[PDB]
Design a protein around this ligand. Structure first.
Ligand SMILES: [Zn+2]
Length: 77
């Protein structure tokens, strides 16, 4: 599903645009990613027309699947 990536790409987490593979979701509020995802998603029906509770759940899952909280590459030349 891409709807998730979009829901999260809508502004759920952040990743170094100079370091591909290195990501980092708003640390301190992982749930915020879901809520925000539900806000954008709900504030903008996606083609997939999936469920909010589903997206959010998938938003927290994906976000968690990224297990990223910083761009260690920031030190990797
Ligand atoms: Zn970086």
């Amino acid at each position: 599903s891409e709807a998730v990536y979009i829901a999260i790409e809508a502004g759920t987490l952040a990743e170094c645009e100079v370091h591909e593979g290195t990501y980092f979701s708003d640390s301190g509020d992982i749930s915020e990613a879901e809520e925000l995802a539900r806000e954008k998603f709900e504030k903008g029906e996606v083609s997939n027309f999936d469920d909010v509770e589903e997206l959010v759940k998938k938003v927290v899952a994906v976000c968690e699947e990224l297990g990223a909280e910083e761009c260690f590459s920031c030190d990797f030349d």
